[PDB]
Scaffold this active site. Structure first.
Site, PDB file in Angstrom:
ATOM      1  N   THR A   1      12.519   4.709  -5.095  1.00 30.95           N
ATOM      2  CA  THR A   1      14.013   4.419  -4.841  1.00 30.95           C
ATOM      3  C   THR A   1      14.372   4.599  -6.056  1.00 30.95           C
ATOM      4  O   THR A   1      13.601   4.828  -7.054  1.00 30.95           O
ATOM      5  CB  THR A   1      14.483   2.714  -4.811  1.00 30.95           C
ATOM      6  OG1 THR A   1      13.490   1.967  -3.843  1.00 30.95           O
ATOM      7  CG2 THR A   1      15.838   2.652  -4.383  1.00 30.95           C
TER       8      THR A   1
HETATM    9  C1  GWZ Z   1      10.673   3.142  -2.625  1.00 25.07           C
HETATM   10  C2  GWZ Z   1      11.423   2.415  -4.079  1.00 25.07           C
HETATM   11  C3  GWZ Z   1      11.383   2.706  -5.389  1.00 25.07           C
HETATM   12  O1  GWZ Z   1      10.171   1.160  -4.373  1.00 25.07           O
HETATM   13  C4  GWZ Z   1      12.768   1.155  -3.977  1.00 25.07           C
HETATM   14  O2  GWZ Z   1      12.804   0.466  -5.040  1.00 25.07           O
HETATM   15  C5  GWZ Z   1      12.558   0.704  -2.292  1.00 25.07           C
HETATM   16  C6  GWZ Z   1      14.203   0.118  -2.173  1.00 25.07           C
HETATM   17  C7  GWZ Z   1      14.136  -1.080  -1.314  1.00 25.07           C
HETATM   18  C8  GWZ Z   1      14.003  -0.436  -0.055  1.00 25.07           C
HETATM   19  C9  GWZ Z   1      15.744  -2.065  -2.005  1.00 25.07           C
HETATM   20  N1  GWZ Z   1      11.790  -0.651  -2.616  1.00 25.07           N
HETATM   21  C10 GWZ Z   1      10.569  -0.828  -1.963  1.00 25.07           C
HETATM   22  O3  GWZ Z   1      10.593   0.139  -1.163  1.00 25.07           O
HETATM   23  C11 GWZ Z   1       9.561  -1.726  -2.677  1.00 25.07           C
HETATM   24  C12 GWZ Z   1       8.887  -1.427  -3.815  1.00 25.07           C
HETATM   25  C13 GWZ Z   1       8.350  -2.556  -3.945  1.00 25.07           C
HETATM   26  C14 GWZ Z   1       6.796  -2.958  -3.113  1.00 25.07           C
HETATM   27  C15 GWZ Z   1       6.247  -4.401  -3.940  1.00 25.07           C
HETATM   28  C16 GWZ Z   1       6.986  -5.064  -4.751  1.00 25.07           C
HETATM   29  C17 GWZ Z   1       8.227  -4.539  -5.192  1.00 25.07           C
HETATM   30  C18 GWZ Z   1       8.395  -3.099  -4.536  1.00 25.07           C
HETATM   31  N2  GWZ Z   1       9.072  -1.948  -0.897  1.00 25.07           N
HETATM   32  C19 GWZ Z   1       9.017  -3.354  -0.549  1.00 25.07           C
HETATM   33  O4  GWZ Z   1       9.542  -4.564  -0.630  1.00 25.07           O
HETATM   34  C20 GWZ Z   1       8.158  -3.729   0.982  1.00 25.07           C
HETATM   35  C21 GWZ Z   1       8.770  -3.808   1.859  1.00 25.07           C
HETATM   36  C22 GWZ Z   1       8.212  -3.921   3.115  1.00 25.07           C
HETATM   37  C23 GWZ Z   1       7.170  -3.082   3.485  1.00 25.07           C
HETATM   38  C24 GWZ Z   1       9.380  -3.870   4.396  1.00 25.07           C
HETATM   39  N3  GWZ Z   1       7.462  -4.764   0.362  1.00 25.07           N
HETATM   40  C25 GWZ Z   1       6.225  -4.923   0.128  1.00 25.07           C
HETATM   41  O5  GWZ Z   1       5.652  -4.049  -0.234  1.00 25.07           O
HETATM   42  C26 GWZ Z   1       5.506  -6.107  -0.408  1.00 25.07           C
HETATM   43  C27 GWZ Z   1       5.998  -7.201  -1.419  1.00 25.07           C
HETATM   44  C28 GWZ Z   1       5.214  -8.317  -1.821  1.00 25.07           C
HETATM   45  C29 GWZ Z   1       5.908  -7.807  -3.068  1.00 25.07           C
HETATM   46  C30 GWZ Z   1       6.888  -8.877  -3.733  1.00 25.07           C
HETATM   47  C31 GWZ Z   1       7.624  -9.356  -4.912  1.00 25.07           C
HETATM   48  C32 GWZ Z   1       6.651  -8.977  -5.371  1.00 25.07           C
HETATM   49  C33 GWZ Z   1       5.106  -8.198  -5.145  1.00 25.07           C
HETATM   50  C34 GWZ Z   1       4.990  -7.876  -3.920  1.00 25.07           C
HETATM   51  N4  GWZ Z   1       4.692  -5.492  -0.564  1.00 25.07           N
HETATM   52  C35 GWZ Z   1       3.337  -5.306   0.490  1.00 25.07           C
HETATM   53  O6  GWZ Z   1       3.259  -5.911   1.753  1.00 25.07           O
HETATM   54  C36 GWZ Z   1       2.186  -5.257   0.148  1.00 25.07           C
HETATM   55  N5  GWZ Z   1       0.825  -4.116   0.707  1.00 25.07           N
HETATM   56  C37 GWZ Z   1       0.348  -3.305  -0.555  1.00 25.07           C
HETATM   57  C38 GWZ Z   1      -0.348  -2.923   0.161  1.00 25.07           C
HETATM   58  O7  GWZ Z   1      -1.352  -3.190   1.553  1.00 25.07           O
HETATM   59  C39 GWZ Z   1      -0.276  -4.321   2.791  1.00 25.07           C
HETATM   60  C40 GWZ Z   1       0.548  -5.197   1.640  1.00 25.07           C
END
Ligand code: GWZ
Ligand code: GWZ
Ligand code: CL
Ligand code: MG
Ligand code: MG
Ligand code: MG
Ligand code: MG
EC number: 3.4.25.1
Lengths: 196, 243, 250, 241, 226, 204, 244, 231
Positions: free
Chosen positions: A1
């Site tokens: 992001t």
């Molecule tokens: C891209 C960016 C720079 O990170 C930017 O901040 C964006 C902003 C959003 C769109 C507002 N953030 C993301 O894309 C997040 C990055 C992130 C990942 C994990 C923790 C914190 C931030 N992505 C997500 O939130 C993602 C959205 C889904 C795909 C719709 N969710 C995950 O990846 C999920 C989060 C679990 C989690 C939540 C909070 C704290 C810690 C962990 N993680 C998974 O599903 C993990 N994944 C790993 C690979 O095998 C499959 C499972």
């Protein structure tokens, strides 16, 4: 992001990339990270998609109820409600939020709220994984009281570089302009911003 | 009959007699007033000197809420304090969540809803005070008066207690003779006069004057008590007008 | 700011009467007439739309309510009490049945749950009984078509046909003469319209009468296709036009 | 005779406390009216400022519940404000939970259900108010829904509330008997406000200055109240034809 | 699992494979992953099977009660909001990953929701283990202003990519089409490209092959009269 | 340590022409130690049959729970519960313990008394339903049972043929699992007669 | 406060009686008569319906006789809605006992539990008592066939034959006259119907007015069968005994 | 009459009869006097006995090193309220390292008494208190009534025949306020004041109770032969 908000002569502009990641897979390439909490108070979201959506939904609720009782809330007030949620639930949240808004009295304002839940009022703010790569660039090229066209270019060039170097950022550059004139949405595609 | 024995019971009229009985406690109390001026508000109150043994200037009646709101009341003094304590909690939670100090109309409804809630059940008694309050916020000066029913409105001038009719007459003259407005320092002088004129209804025991004010120019929009030379100047002006 | 009414407001008097229940039944008597008739292939429930003002839009006030796809309800008495009972009846059909067994409750058991709620308002602390009598018509696979009455006490009874409220004594006599065990649904609708005309003073048409049936499955009202077992709701509210058509052959 | 003090049945099947709450409704001695246009819903109410010491800008019985929903109250101001705050909270909570703006009729139902509970539970008294909710609903169009201390509610083509409600009601009834339609066939809300004021003048038999009236207007996606100067513009247009 | 959603001219289509697994074993070859929330709001499920069923039924139950309360046909945004708040509260522990689609008085809608409670908007979406295979097809053949016929074709092709290339997915393609101003059409087993061939041999045994110790009648009837 | 394989055991169910069959082994152990050779895993509530594999304390607890619930059902409904409805009740009851589940693998079998239609279903420990046309398997030798059933099964088998198929599926699957066997029971279920047969099998 | 409106449902009178219990018993005295008779080879439960209307659907109706489990049934006199609250509690208690001990609940234990619930409403909570009297008919392997009654006080007692509801004084005299210890079920059926036929406030006793049931250890191979009589079966037993 | 059954009911003239009846319990209590100068503050209390075999009921209670009160009315209610004051004084010390202001102590008592006058089930406190103290703004004397009304005074008296002592202090006001740096003369003036409320009985050694607080004087109670000096 990669996200930023920049105050200028006529108000404030918010900017963001459009990438959402699961590991190294791009779950959404056309994400909208610029979200409305009030008519002229918006936020840029970074960190967990679930957490920042949940927070933003609660803040929108709180400001809608504020408006019903007390009239239009200030940008400072919106930032305070974000802070309260981020600070008090710091152990269970991963949210980095920039709050930006336009009053007629206060004009353009920007507040950044990092992981701890602290608040910082600033002329402009940058955040997200891709922001690390543009601290140098943004510090050297930011001026106060820029025009609308200058501020659009400043954000476009800045996020272009953030996207170029950060694998976690990409897609389109979305922007939201907040002035007395109203609310304008802008979009900029790869073919435009990559060649800059 | 029996409709007046329990709070929250409608009589066949559509009246809550217990609330109307609380108003009688208010009518029995000392006189208190409020004057809205150009950039602020002035509050004044009659303190009856029951005995020489009362320490002068010590038994303070006017109360501050947050740093910008003044509250004065007539009736059961402890009920007024209870209401101000709640007002302080309401102002604190507003400032905690929203950052900005509570606006005066917002603060007025917080007291209003709380007083109104004490007319909804038989397990509680209505408030035995009418409360005059206000201050300066972002939108300017505001003066309010709140009754035992929970009813409140905005005011140019306000008065309650035993001398209210006398005071209301004097306030009505000021509104007619000053349409462009009254200054803050003028309002202090006039507040002293009105309390002195209203003292004819409580004329047996001598009294002590107490004034406070919030003004954008004179106090930076903060609530302060009128003290020393400015208090004596207002007493002298009041003493001259009665003679 | 306390609920101190932890004691019963309905008690036994020296004569053995539960006063508040009797007084609730009196409120039901003052209410507008409603009726129910059971046929071989269906059930009909009906009532008068007593409009409080001609400026009021009587379409917005629904006296006849769907509870489940195969169960409907009508009342006589206090309308607001009925409205909250319909809300609770719809919810309890899900919470205490559909979320457990994956199917809608049979008529008798939903009636039993509504009855329970009304009984509790007759014994619990700090409340009055509900000022309504309900008529609940329904269908289920193993019991077939059925019609139930529920009173302020919580008591309920199954009926072949009945009436409640204003002109119920006269209406029940009229139904005793006309009812037989070989009635088709159309015959029961015809008898329902005849019975209801006696208790109505003013205008008598599709806009002043509210009528619904529990009949055949309506696959056209389901809203989707592709599942053979889901054949549609048996509850159907008759339109203003559909009522007027049957009033010409009256 | 304690069956007249709390909300339990009298021998006649009546709730006397509900009936007496209805009488509290007229304590303010104010009349309100609501009508529907093509694109709008207008609500007007009498404004009486007896005391010269009152700030007239703070004296009001019209409330902005949400962006789309307005509410006029007939009854004492404490109960009016109690009802207003609750309706605001309920409208905001609905939006948060279900993701769309609370419809006027649904809010009316909710507030009516709350009013019903006070008629059934002893420790809570009824509120001595009648609540007239107005909006331009995105599904149903121009909408008027009214709630009372019995917990009764219904939709309206037009409505009136207050001491002289019957006089206003019959005036409106007679207009809709002529036109044979459920609304005021008029494009602009300005002319629908002019209709509302005109028919209140005819029904009550009194003339109005700018400070004697209070007006609320619902359009698609907003509800707003008119200023004294906006009303004056309305009064000038009525007089000129 | 492979599940997809595709927007078109006058509506939205969702699709899914029919395989459910338990470790590397296929528990059910004809699983139904298209869940009806309300008549015109349907969703495709991936993840923990019990959780997806429970979550669709709970929100579907509450949506039905909301529809009766408001006298309005249910909206997709309401199902979305109720699903996300429920899933957020349980902090990802309820393993439901869903594609939520439908038509309502506001128009046609397509969303995805993840187990932690985040949602997203799109014209085309995929979820489950086969989502990369499906998204490859969608990114290669999607265009603006698709017809109904084109969207069904694209959706099923995207599921097929999951069937053939992802070991998590298999068997048949289920489709549901939701068009504005029409009944939703659920097409169970829309494609059947995985029928088992005839076996070489019959394994029917001669009667008496299995050794028995005891026989007895089991009383399933209630206690009898007389 | 793994609760689903402390005690051991298996259940299998199959459909035929106007009939269903459900079968189980008789072993209960504490890991390597065989304790009981009479621990039946199939129960019935009216005409609906339930087999349960997994942790034995939960097998017993859930039998007692569904006896309780189906008894109350019958009193209120005034009829016996059907297989389709009972399946939903099992699922509801398992899922309400989502985050502290019963460590079990239930199997429903029976004939709907009104429609006459053969019915079988299986569940995971948190209540997900697998409603199969052909067969359902459960327990420590589930892999083995899947293999046997998938090869041996053909549709529309007569009751006495279906007995041979299900018995051979159970026996040969059990003999490849250390924690299953020690005897076996087979129920053949028709619309209004149910035959129960104990099978001779190897006792190791 | 709220004290003003409290009826005080759980107090003694000066004479040492519980007002609300006594007034509940007065309510029950107007309810339709229910009779229980215990024989050596079974129990009979007979009861008179209160609301004669030709349009009442009788075959699907149940106001008097309810099943608690396979071995135990109750006849109700009083408020039906109150009784159903207690019945469902008793059904649950029986299944709790079966779950715990893997044995059907003994009749007295079920009766005591329900009677204790009724007692509680007379001593604490400030609520009105349940306006219900039960006749319990049941079997267990300890005491065999048993008849009990309970009333709103929470007191219970055992009986060879008993009546509750209307005209109990008259009914109990007639039962005391014709009952004998060596009596059988078929004879007890006749006694129950003859007693109702004389005590009834109606002009004649008919099939549409009655609910009838038997608990026999005359099932196939020494089990216990609960028979709730259908309308046609009540009509047949009325002709057989010679009442119609 | 009909409006005195509980504290939650106003009478038609806006009176709270239960509060007024509680006020009556104070008038039945034994006399106690309070007075102060700029340096010191004094309590004088006439203790009451049940009979000649009994002890004399203690009237004065210490709240902190710099604050205490005398009671008149229900003694158990004085125990509840003094315990509350002890805790509030203590909270101020532990949390803020701050001796509680006498004016703020009065405000806390007022608010505690008030809650009992507005809610159902509870009753008003049946006791009046005279609080003396020395804080950062010098010597203080307060009068507490269970209506909630608290008053700062140079001198006062409460209890039976208290009007006699109150008149004396009203005359003596100009004299006793000036008694600075002389505790014995300030006590003399308090003992002479309480003497104006006596009839028949006189001040004996186990009858009289005196307390003092001041500039370099902790709150100390004098009973028995320690008060023989002042008789
Ligand atoms: C891209 C960016 C720079 O990170 C930017 O901040 C964006 C902003 C959003 C769109 C507002 N953030 C993301 O894309 C997040 C990055 C992130 C990942 C994990 C923790 C914190 C931030 N992505 C997500 O939130 C993602 C959205 C889904 C795909 C719709 N969710 C995950 O990846 C999920 C989060 C679990 C989690 C939540 C909070 C704290 C810690 C962990 N993680 C998974 O599903 C993990 N994944 C790993 C690979 O095998 C499959 C499972
Ligand atoms: C198959 C797919 C391509 O992944 C697709 O997403 C489908 C979509 C469903 C049908 C809507 N998902 C599945 O088939 C899941 C995959 C999965 C497995 C395990 C964890 C998460 C996801 N399959 C199931 O959920 C499976 C359904 C049964 C076969 C009917 N259930 C299990 O495998 C079950 C899950 C238990 C569980 C508990 C707590 C949190 C998460 C999951 N596990 C077992 O049955 C394993 N074991 C339990 C003890 O007895 C022996 C078997
Ligand atoms: Cl509600
Ligand atoms: Mg990049
Ligand atoms: Mg009430
Ligand atoms: Mg083995
Ligand atoms: Mg071995």
């Amino acid at each position: 992001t990669s996200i930023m908000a920049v105050t200028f002569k006529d108000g404030v502009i918010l900017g963001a990339d459009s990438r959402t990641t699961t590991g190294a897979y791009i779950a959404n390439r056309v994400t909208d990270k610029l979200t409305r909490v009030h008519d002229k108070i918006w936020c840029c979201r970074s960190g967990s998609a679930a957490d920042t959506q949940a927070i933003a939904d609660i803040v929108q609720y709180h400001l809608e109820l504020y408006t019903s009782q007390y009239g239009t809330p200030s940008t400072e007030t919106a930032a305070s409600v974000f802070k309260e949620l981020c600070y008090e639930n710091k152990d269970n949240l991963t949210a980095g939020i920039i709050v930006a808004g336009y009053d007629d009295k206060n004009k353009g304002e920007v507040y950044t709220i990092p992981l701890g839940g602290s608040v910082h009022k600033l002329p402009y703010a940058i955040a997200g994984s891709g922001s690390t790569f543009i601290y140098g660039y943004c510090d050297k090229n930011f001026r106060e009281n820029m025009s609308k066209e200058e501020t659009v270019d400043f954000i476009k060039h800045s996020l272009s570089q953030a996207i170029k170097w950060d694998g976690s950022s990409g897609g389109v550059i979305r922007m939201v302009v907040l002035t007395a004139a109203g609310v304008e949405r802008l979009i900029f595609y790869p073919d435009e911003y990559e060649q800059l | 009959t029996g409709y007046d024995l329990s709070n929250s019971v409608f009589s066949p009229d559509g009246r809550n007699f217990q609330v109307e009985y609380a108003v009688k406690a208010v009518e029995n109390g000392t006189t208190s007033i409020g004057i809205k001026c150009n950039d602020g508000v002035v509050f004044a109150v009659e303190k009856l000197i029951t005995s020489k043994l009362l320490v002068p200037q010590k038994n303070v009646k006017i109360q501050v809420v947050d740093r910008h709101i003044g509250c004065v009341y007539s009736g059961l003094i402890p009920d007024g304090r209870h209401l101000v304590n709640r007002g302080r909690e309401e102002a604190a939670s507003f400032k905690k969540l929203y950052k900005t100090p509570i606006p005066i109309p917002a603060f007025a409804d917080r007291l209003g809803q709380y007083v109104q809630a004490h007319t909804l059940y038989n397990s509680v008694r209505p408030f035995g005070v009418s409360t005059i309050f206000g201050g300066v916020d972002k939108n300017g000066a505001h003066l309010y008066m709140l009754e035992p029913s929970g009813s409140y409105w905005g005011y140019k001038g306000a008065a309650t207690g035993k001398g209210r009719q006398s005071a209301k007459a004097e306030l009505e003259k000021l509104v007619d003779h000053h349409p462009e407005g009254l200054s803050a320092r003028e309002a202090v002088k006039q507040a002293a006069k009105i309390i002195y004129l209203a003292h004819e209804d409580n004329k047996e025991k001598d009294f002590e004057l107490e004034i406070s004010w919030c003004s954008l120019s004179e106090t930076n929009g903060l609530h302060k008590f009128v003290k020393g030379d400015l208090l004596q100047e207002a007493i002298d002006f009041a003493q001259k007008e009665i003679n | 700011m306390t609920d101190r009414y932890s004691f019963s407001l309905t008690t036994f008097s020296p004569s053995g009467k539960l006063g508040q229940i009797d007084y609730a039944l009196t409120a039901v008597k003052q209410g507008v007439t409603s009726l129910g008739i059971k046929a071989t292939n269906g059930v009909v429930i009906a009532t008068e739309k007593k409009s409080s003002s001609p400026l009021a839009m009587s379409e917005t006030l629904s006296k006849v309510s769907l509870l489940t796809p195969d169960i409907g309800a009508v009342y006589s008495g206090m309308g607001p009490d009925y409205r909250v009972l319909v809300d609770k009846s719809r919810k309890v059909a899900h919470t205490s049945y559909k979320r457990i067994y994956g199917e809608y409750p049979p008529t008798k058991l939903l009636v039993s749950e509504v009855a329970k709620i009304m009984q509790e308002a007759t014994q619990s602390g700090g409340v009055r009984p509900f000022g309504v009598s309900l008529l609940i018509a329904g269908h289920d696979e193993f019991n077939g078509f059925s019609l139930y009455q529920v009173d302020p006490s919580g008591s309920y009874f199954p009926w072949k046909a009945t009436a409640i409220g204003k002109g119920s004594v006269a209406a029940k006599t009229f139904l005793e003469k006309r009812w037989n065990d070989e009635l088709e649904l159309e015959d029961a609708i015809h008898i329902a319209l005849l019975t209801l005309k006696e208790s109505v003073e003013g205008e008598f048409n599709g806009d002043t009468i509210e009528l619904a049936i529990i009949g055949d499955e309506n696959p056209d009202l389901l809203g989707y296709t592709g599942i053979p077992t889901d054949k549609g709701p048996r509850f159907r509210k008759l339109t203003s036009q559909e009522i007027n058509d049957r009033l010409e052959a009256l | 005779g304690y069956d007249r003090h709390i909300t339990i049945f009298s021998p006649e099947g009546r709730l006397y406390q509900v009936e007496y709450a209805f009488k509290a409704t007229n304590q303010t001695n104010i009349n309100s009216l609501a009508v529907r246009g093509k694109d709008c819903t207008v609500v007007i109410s009498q404004k009486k400022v007896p005391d010269k010491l009152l700030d007239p800008t703070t004296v009001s019985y019209i409330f902005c519940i949400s962006r789309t929903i307005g509410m006029v109250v007939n009854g004492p101001i404490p109960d009016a404000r109690n009802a207003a705050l609750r309706a605001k909270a309920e409208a905001a909570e609905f939006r948060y939970k279900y993701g769309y703006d609370m419809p006027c009729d649904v809010l009316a139902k909710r507030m009516a259900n709350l009013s019903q509970i006070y008629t059934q539970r002893a420790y809570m008294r009824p509120l001595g108010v009648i609540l007239t909710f107005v909006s331009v609903d995105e599904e149903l169009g121009p909408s008027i829904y009214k709630t009372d201390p019995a917990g009764y509610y219904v939709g309206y083509k037009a409505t009136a509330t207050g001491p002289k409600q019957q006089e206003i009601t019959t005036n409106l009834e007679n207009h809709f008997k002529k036109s044979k339609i459920d609304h005021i066939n008029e494009e602009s809300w300005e002319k629908v406000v002019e209709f509302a004021i005109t028919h209140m003048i005819d029904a009550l038999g009194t003339e109005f200055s700018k400070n004697d009236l209070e007006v609320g207007v619902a359009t698609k996606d907003k509800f707003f109240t008119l200023s004294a100067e906006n009303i004056e513009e309305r009064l000038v247009a009525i007089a000129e034809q | 699992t492979t599940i997809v959603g595709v927007k078109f001219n006058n509506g939205v289509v969702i699709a899914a494979d029919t395989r459910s697994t338990q470790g590397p074993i296929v528990a059910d070859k004809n699983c139904a992953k298209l869940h009806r929330i309300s008549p015109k709001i349907w969703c495709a499920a991936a993840g923990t099977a019990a959780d997806t069923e429970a979550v669709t039924q709970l929100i579907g139950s509450n949506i039905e009660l909301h529809s009766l309360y408001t006298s309005r046909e249910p909206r997709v945004v309401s199902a979305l909001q109720m699903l996300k708040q429920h899933l957020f509260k349980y902090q990802g522990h309820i393993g439901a990953y869903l594609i939520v689609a439908g038509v309502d008085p506001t128009g046609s809608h397509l969303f995805s929701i993840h187990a932690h409670g985040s949602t997203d908007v799109g014209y085309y979406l995929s979820l489950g283990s086969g989502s990369l295979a499906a998204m490859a097809v969608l990114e290669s053949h999607w265009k603006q202003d698709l017809t109904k016929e084109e969207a069904i074709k694209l959706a099923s092709d995207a599921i097929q990519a999951g069937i053939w290339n992802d070991l998590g997915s298999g068997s048949n393609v289920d489709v549901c089409v939701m068009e504005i101003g029409k009944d939703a059409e659920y097409l169970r087993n829309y494609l059947t490209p995985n029928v088992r061939e005839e076996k070489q041999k019959s394994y029917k045994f001669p009667r008496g092959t299995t050794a028995v110790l005891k026989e007895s009648i089991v009383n399933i009837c209630d206690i009898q009269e007389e | 340590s793994d609760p689903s394989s402390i005690n051991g055991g298996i259940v299998v169910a199959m459909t035929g022409k106007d009939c269903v069959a459900i079968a189980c082994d008789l072993r209960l152990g504490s890991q390597s130690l065989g304790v009981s050779n009479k621990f039946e895993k199939i129960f019935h509530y009216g005409h609906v049959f339930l087999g349960i594999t997994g942790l034995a304390t939960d097998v017993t607890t859930l039998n007692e729970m569904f006896r309780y619930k189906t008894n109350l059902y019958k009193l209120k409904e005034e009829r016996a519960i059907e297989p389709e409805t009972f399946t939903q009740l099992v699922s509801s009851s398992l899922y309400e313990r989502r985050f502290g589940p019963y460590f079990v693998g239930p199997v429903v079998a029976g004939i709907n008394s009104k429609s006459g239609k053969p019915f079988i279903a299986g569940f995971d420990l948190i209540g997900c339903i697998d409603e199969a046309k052909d067969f359902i398997v459960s327990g420590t030798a589930s892999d083995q049972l899947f293999g046997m059933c998938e090869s041996l099964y053909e549709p529309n088998l007569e009751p006495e043929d279906l007995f041979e198929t299900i018995s051979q599926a159970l026996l040969n699957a059990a003999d490849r699992d250390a924690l299953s066997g020690w005897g076996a029971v087979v129920y053949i279920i028709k619309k209004d007669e149910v035959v129960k047969r104990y099978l001779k099998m190897r006792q190791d | 406060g709220s004290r003003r409106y409290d009826s005080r449902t759980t107090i003694f009178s000066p004479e040492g009686r519980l007002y609300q219990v006594e007034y509940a018993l007065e309510s029950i005295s107007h309810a339709g008569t229910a009779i229980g008779i215990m024989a050596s080879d079974g129990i009979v439960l007979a009861a008179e319906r209160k609301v004669t209307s030709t349009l009442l659907e009788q075959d699907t109706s149940t106001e008097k006789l309810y099943k608690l489990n396979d071995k135990i049934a109750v006849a109700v006199a009083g408020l039906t809605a109150d009784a159903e609250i207690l019945i469902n509690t008793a059904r649950i208690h029986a299944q709790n006992y079966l779950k715990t001990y893997n044995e059907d609940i003994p009749v007295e234990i079920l009766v005591r539990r329900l009677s204790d619930i009724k007692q509680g409403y007379t001593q604490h909570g400030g609520l009105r008592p349940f306006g219900v009297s039960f006749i319990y008919a049941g079997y267990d392997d300890r005491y065999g066939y048993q008849l009990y009654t309970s009333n709103p006080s929470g007191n219970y007692t055992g009986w060879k034959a008993i009546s509750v509801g209307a005209n109990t004084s008259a009914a109990q005299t007639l039962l005391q006259m014709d009952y004998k210890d060596d009596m059988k079920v078929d004879d007890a059926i006749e006694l129950a119907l003859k007693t109702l036929s004389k005590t009834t406030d109606s002009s004649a006793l008919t099939y549409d007015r009655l609910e009838f049931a038997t608990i026999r250890k005359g099932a196939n191979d020494g089990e216990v069968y609960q028979k709730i009589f259908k309308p046609q079966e009540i009509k047949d037993i009325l002709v057989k005994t010679g009442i119609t | 009459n009909n409006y005195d059954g509980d504290t939650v009911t106003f009478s038609p003239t806006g009176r709270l009869f239960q509060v007024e009846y509680a006020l009556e319990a104070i008038k039945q209590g034994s006399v106690t006097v309070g007075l102060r100068s700029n340096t010191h503050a004094v309590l004088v209390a006439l203790k009451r006995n049940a009979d000649e075999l009994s002890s004399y009921q203690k009237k004065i209670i210490k709240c902190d090193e710099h604050m205490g009160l005398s009671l008149a009315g229900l003694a158990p209610d004085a125990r509840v309220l003094s315990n509350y004051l002890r805790q509030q004084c203590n909270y101020s010390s532990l949390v803020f390292n701050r001796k509680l202001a006498v004016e703020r102590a009065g405000h806390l008592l007022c608010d505690k008494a008030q809650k009992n006058t507005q809610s159902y089930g509870g009753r008003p406190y049946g006791v009046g208190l005279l609080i003396i103290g020395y804080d950062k703004s010098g010597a203080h004397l307060l009068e507490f009534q269970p209506s909630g009304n608290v008053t700062e005074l140079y001198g006062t008296a409460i209890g039976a025949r208290s009007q006699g002592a109150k008149t004396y202090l009203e005359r003596t006001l100009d004299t006793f306020i000036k008694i600075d740096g002389n505790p014995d003369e300030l006590i003399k003036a308090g003992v002479e004041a309480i003497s104006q409320s006596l009839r028949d009985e006189s001040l004996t050694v186990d009858n009289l109770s005196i307390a003092i607080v001041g500039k370099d004087t902790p709150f100390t109670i004098y009973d028995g032969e320690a008060v023989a000096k002042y008789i």
